[PDB]
Amino acid sequence: SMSYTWTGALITPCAAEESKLPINPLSNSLLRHHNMVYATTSRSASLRQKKVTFDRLQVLDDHYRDVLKEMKAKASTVKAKLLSIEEACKLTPPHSAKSKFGYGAKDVRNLSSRAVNHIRSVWEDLLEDTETPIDTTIMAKSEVFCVQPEKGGRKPARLIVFPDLGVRVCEKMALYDVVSTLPQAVMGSSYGFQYSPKQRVEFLVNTWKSKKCPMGFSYDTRCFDSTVTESDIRVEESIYQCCDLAPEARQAIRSLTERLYIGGPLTNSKGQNCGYRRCRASGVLTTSCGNTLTCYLKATAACRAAKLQDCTMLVNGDDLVVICESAGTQEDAAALRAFTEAMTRYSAPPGDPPQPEYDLELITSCSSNVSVAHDASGKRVYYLTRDPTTPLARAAWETARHTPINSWLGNIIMYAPTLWARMILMTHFFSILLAQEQLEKALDCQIFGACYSIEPLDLPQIIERLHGLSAFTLHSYSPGEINRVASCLRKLGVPPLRTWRHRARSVRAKLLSQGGRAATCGRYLFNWAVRTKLKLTPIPAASQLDLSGWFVAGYSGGDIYHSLSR
Incomplete structure (x- = not known):
């Protein structure tokens, strides 16, 4: 056969x-x-x-x-x-x-x-x-x-x-x-x-x-x-x-x-x-x-x-x-x-x-694979990471040319806790969004093969319900993980990780000086990039406003769409 x-x-x-x-x-x-x-x-x-x-x-x-x-x-x-x-x-x-x-x-x-x-x-x-x-x-x-x-x-x-x-x-x-x-x-x-x-x-x-x-x-x-x-x-x-x-x-x-x-x-x-x-x-x-x-x-x-x-x-x-x-x-x-x-x-x-x-x-x-970092309290947190080569390359493609699918939005969501998502992909795309006008324009990304319409000003609450509060406060990542990312940056020609800490302040600042749904995005997301970090307490809208259907089934190749979430 x-x-x-x-x-x-x-x-x-x-x-x-x-x-x-x-x-x-x-x-x-x-x-x-x-x-x-x-x-x-x-x-x-x-x-x-x-x-x-x-x-x-x-x-x-x-x-x-x-x-x-x-x-x-x-x-x-x-x-x-x-x-x-x-x-x-x-x-x-x-x-x-x-x-x-x-x-x-x-x-x-x-x-x-x-x-x-x-x-x-x-x-x-x-x-x-x-x-x-x-x-x-x-x-x-x-x-x-x-x-x-x-x-x-x-x-x-x-x-x-x-x-x-x-x-x-x-x-x-x-x-x-x-x-x-x-x-x-x-x-x-x-x-x-x-x-x-x-x-x-x-x-x-x-x-x-x-x-x-x-x-x-x-x-x-x-x-x-x-x-x-x-x-x-x-x-x-x-x-x-x-x-x-x-x-x-x-x-x-x-x-x-x-x-x-x-x-x-x-x-x-x-x-x-x-x-x-x-x-x-x-x-x-x-x-x-x-x-x-x-x-x-x-x-x-x-x-x-x-x-x-x-x-x-x-x-x-x-x-x-x-x-x-x-x-x-x-x-x-x-x-x-x-x-x-x-x-x-x-x-x-x-x-x-x-x-x-x-x-x-x-x-x-x-x-993907499991890695370890620590949150403020110092406690060992387990999180899910991945070689960023394909997400970082896809992100570069999506910048240069317009496309329905924004896999970058998807990787930010799914890999919010990771070093490379926070320092590179959040920083880069919020900059672009900030400079352009587009913080409210909902974008289409896929989770488990199913497309979702999603507003980028709702990442702080999405990330908190899907990963917890440690996702904004993680810091001392493993040597192996850090070495993968640094290596991947060389291979691709992505600027070194210390380069992004500088950029991430400007973006955070340009976004605290805006207030509202913008404001919140700068408090929790780019907290890793400030010199004396402030104390992040759980977001209100997170719980009694967002909803399921998100991690129920696999729909790959199945022509499935939710205009769910934001």
Whole structure:
């Protein structure tokens, strides 16, 4: 079973494609080495195709079946509701790809006559037609990175595969509630997306110390989406079907499984047939949930087969971290080898072989890792950090050119406590915002694949609820962390960290001398940069004004939007 068949037609771009940074003088002294920063394009689509096209052998054993049944039993607990056309319509992102049938995302959210009447047809057809493969578009995704340490080495583009907008709304009607409810109900504390980064670190540590002599590792599968088999996709549906479901929902889920989720024809932006998918589509609603369940399933079964002891996992789509209990250094080396054999049999082979780890801080997953600093009281605080190379490069790109997605806003939020977010990314972007006019203009950023509309004057209260008060008051970061950031600054040509302390005062001052929501941003955010720090007490609006829905589920590739928060 091949993940992909290709006809020969190209993955084409739909417009103009940017690949290098522009000669922009206030990307400037964010970053001067612009040769380092690039964006992926259609040109490298072929290279990705080769990487992502292969046969899939799958051998299921008693462990897999045993784990499946325990999952289904947990799933049998769930009752899932059918969404109405109006509710699914509201979940649609303002700049989601328009339909072939002469209407766009705007028309959907307005409940336009042409849009809801097409949507009803797609739904009715899901009921009348039970097997005809549903069309998708394949495209190259444009992502920014920093040139790889073997001389301008480069990641090729990712392929994004999605059905027409009308189908996307129907998926929401049938599977939105399911996808927001079932993963937690099945996987419990092992479901990553229920955790704020503060809750995430809290669960990591707690699990680590609950161990005699802990041992953890992270597992990376070689292009997970392609490893997912038609069997996997069906096993997945069998889990969904354990929910209490409306009869049309049940049919809709059944049809979407056979007509879309298991595979179907690929069409480029020119209308040409590119070939056929028999693996996971990156851009359907079920992609995160389905991946999270499928990764959790294969891994739990692989642990048992590998005879690892007191495995706890934390799963986030295809990102997988295991914290378990160590039988004596070449104990696990062997046990991981076994684990890897089992994952490989289940059709989930690794990228780089997994390595046992006996220091929590050295384990990296979700691109991130735990580090330690201290807050005013001097007490050791645990926080979640990351190599800043890709965020700092993306920040430079977003300065130089306009873009819907502002990942910088996202990294500030998610990595508020980190040294590099506070000194560089807050300082730089509040300066730009200050000088421009734009402190109130809400911006779109993504958390867990779902886009959010967010006002930058609400970071002090967002940061406080998601990270606590220590996020503004942390100071004596580890030598390892500080050395990563300093190193990353050299590689990119970002000015040294002491450079930013100077800049951060001016920005703080230009923003205390403004008052209001501005004012607050200068008190707590840039407190690290003043000479005799003032005493920061908890913000009022933080609690009884801001709201959930934020760390409930993973929605990557699922066309999901909340205009939640500010």
